[PDB]
């Protein structure tokens, strides 16, 4: 008989009605969780904004972009930008922030659009190109192995890539997942982009499939008013395959550099780092 | 062993990625079906704008405002209006045409934010009170019987009364779900509001629970191509709701009731499509 | 991301480890349920035990069979009793009963089977037919309407039908269910078959497609050493259909008659029928 | 409004009908893959046959037995077997072939019963107790570490090797998990007991939480046709499992670990596909 009636389709919304599971405990801790950005460190604002200023761009594209954050500044320091995700639940953020500072003009000129890494391409019209582009925060690693052969992961980058305009600079990052793959532990409040400020607990489980590493999945545990859980999944770059992967987006047409944490990269340093960060410039 | 690994949680969202359903079939289809509102119908325009003047509304509140095209008429004619509505993939569109409108005062000075009938009280610094609440095309309906008693239906119905001013309206509607218990058959493009664009097909499956009618659920089949989704409805027969609405001001109240705009004097040879219900209140 | 890792498929089995569902809460108080025949009733003996003797019924075949009770009756007043049923989980307990009793010659001579209603020619090799087919206890009603148009229904019936050898028997049954439709319940512990001994409780739910009735589904609660749930869903079969169905089967050519429980059936009579049994004999 | 509407509770069943999935694609490869027992290797044969020979067993529990090939055996050389297993889709065939065979006396007197490892004393009135208790084939490693100790391993072993009589044998395997831990990989076709006969392919999935490999997950892709199923396994190290077992009596035993059926020598040049453990109880 093993049918399965259901009162509404995966995927849709009545008007009385709070969606899908947007009720639901993980999605509540979870949205502390995005919303836990509240200390950028100072660090990361000096680094960014320097490495922008330092190159001359002024027109940037952050693909990726969550609730915001990393644009909220960018649009703060009179940068010019367009924002994309894929997401509306963390759209809906970035879009919220912008009505709530809708008189600040340098505000009134954000732009926030849904767009797809697969489809990038088409998704923005990138005009003779960006400045630079920022996909910063670990966000690329949300992006699956789903075909087996990383032809997706390649396809992605193509895509962003292809967003920067000659001579731009595309600056994208990787949690160092050559030592979470070593230790096995994905260590909480590294974030060296946003310094937490929620307590939190974190179980790491990584999947190897046929021997090569396929996934890390993350179960948080954190403390509210209360022991809440949730679980995200991420693809573990280690650093040669993202450096091929990276470079060969742009053909091969680049100058290169690889940060520490925002500092550079000898590659058998005493210090390890917590995330990596590409920055990459192009042609002519 | 029958463990149930899964790569994120229902409910969460990660950067680079389509949430959850959203790129999926079924939330395809359903979204060129609640698009699917562009000729609203020129005898409810004149209806409802005409109901709020006659009774000197200018502070009204959409509870149930969905993609906000009852809103957006309301706001351009000059009216001064607050929408809320507790689905943010529906809000989504509402806040879309806000910011895409935002030069226009009128509609700087909309107001949407996120609200649930069942908190409704503490959801909406009700002020004084709204001089009308509207909550139109048949939305109230979405609310599901889920307790067994129908303490939610009135839960809900109490919370957005008590959002009305005294003297003032509350405008809430059902379709005639009587005539649907009666034939069966939910029938489609009936939607007095918006007249609908869309040649779609509809599968009718009511769910009656110890001999009391419990459930509507419509399966919508849609020419896009030939996709599918469906949604679901707690039936309201005119009169249950007829006592729940009217119990839901304790009872004092201005109670008629619509035909579709036109009246409605029971047993009369024209049968319904939706029941308007215009409240006001005495106490 | 949303794949759905699973530790091992929808189906399988492993060798140290209880399969499925099997050690859940349903399956425990269905478990309950199923077994729950230990009074047959006297009136259900007698009258069986009379159709068939008084056709000079002697090989007969038992079409989902269940546990087998109708079945080990049969085989205990020396009839030739071929049993099938397309499940399992309750073929296990008449395969169970007969090892059990394996010594009788009687029971020995039992045969037990997988088939299926809707492959049941290719399933059992008839021979020249069965004297009797019996399929009794409202099981047919277990089939659903799954493509929308009964055929199913219909080829469910035709095969069980060819079973039955010239101037053989079908004996077949439902619940009344014009009744159930009507008064919407359908009341526990009316079973004519075996008085029921376990103390439950039960809530019906009728669904109704575009105004054709399509599905009962009881939940049934009951009490152990606790108040444990769990779901079956039938086809209700109104008389007239039914009859249309069942006749149609053997192309028409039949004697067709149908009881009330065990007694004749005059429509319109003051008595209302708990299940309908309808006894068909064939063509010459 | 997220309800979930079933036709039937999992677990249960109805009389016209197949179980629950019983009818299914993987379920239709798999039954494929547990029949693969035609030929036993003769190695083996020859190897168990000996084993409880020279050391006089003959009363003899098959503790997860399956479709009970390794039972069959013992059956037809005279030996006096219960075999007990939690699964009801496997029992089933030992069941079968049983009444199948049910003439023969020596199978008249085979025991096939239900039992469960958790469970395993008071599931099996184990009298004086047994001279041979074999789990064979690595069937322990289907049960997995669902509380994140271990606990549950060592009540298994537990329950087991109380089965086994003073003086008496208790026979359980593993695959060499060390082995598929450094490849990564669980070559296809090692069955070193039951020479496969399916031309099947494998992918390898290993679950490592908090650094500590939690789970083999194969995923068999079967020419019956191009099908697949997915079986999981917990990855006993030698080590590990030779603690886990050897506590298991406490600590009263003569405890030797077998290669493929030869003796295992740590540090030689063959690897073994599978760990034979072998032991004697001394009080």
Redesign the interface.
């Known amino acids: 008989?093993?049918?399965?009636?259901?009162?509404?389709?995966?995927?849709?919304?009545?008007?009385?009605?709070?969606?899908?599971?947007?009720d639901?405990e993980?999605?509540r801790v979870?949205q502390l969780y995005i919303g836990d950005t509240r200390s950028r460190t100072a660090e990361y604002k000096a680094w960014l904004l320097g490495l922008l200023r330092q190159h001359g761009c002024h027109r940037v594209l952050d693909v990726?972009?969550?609730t915001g954050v990393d644009s909220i500044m960018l649009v703060e320091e009179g940068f010019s930008v367009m924002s994309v995700?894929?997401?509306?639940?963390?759209l809906?953020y970035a879009?919220k922030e912008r009505?709530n500072r809708?008189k600040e003009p340098s505000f009134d000129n954000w732009v926030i659009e849904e767009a797809?890494?697969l489809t990038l391409d088409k998704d923005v019209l990138s005009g003779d190109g960006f400045d630079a582009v920022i996909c910063l925060?670990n966000?690329?690693a949300?992006?699956?192995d789903?075909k087996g052969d990383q032809s997706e992961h390649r396809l992605?980058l193509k895509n962003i890539a292809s967003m920067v305009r000659p001579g731009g600079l595309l600056v994208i990052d990787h949690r160092n997942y050559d030592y979470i793959l070593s230790?096995?532990?994905a260590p909480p409040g590294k974030n060296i982009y946003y310094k937490s400020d929620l307590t939190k607990d974190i179980?790491?489980?990584?999947?190897?499939?046929?021997?090569?590493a396929?996934?890390v999945?993350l179960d948080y545990t954190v403390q509210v008013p209360g022991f809440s859980?949730?679980?995200?999944?991420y693809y573990p770059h280690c650093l040669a395959s993202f450096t091929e992967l990276v470079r060969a987006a742009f053909g091969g047409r680049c100058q290169h550099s690889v940060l520490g944490d925002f500092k550079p990269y000898k590659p058998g340093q005493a210090y390890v780092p917590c995330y990596f960060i590409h920055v990459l410039k192009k042609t002519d």
């Open positions: 008989v093993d049918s399965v009636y259901r009162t509404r389709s995966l995927g849709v919304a009545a008007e009385g009605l709070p969606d899908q599971y947007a639901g993980a999605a979870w990726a972009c969550g995700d894929a997401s509306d639940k963390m809906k879009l009505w809708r797809n890494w925060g966000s690329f949300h992006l699956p789903c992605a230790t096995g532990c179980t790491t489980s990584v999947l190897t499939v046929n021997n090569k396929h996934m999945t859980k949730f679980r995200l999944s």
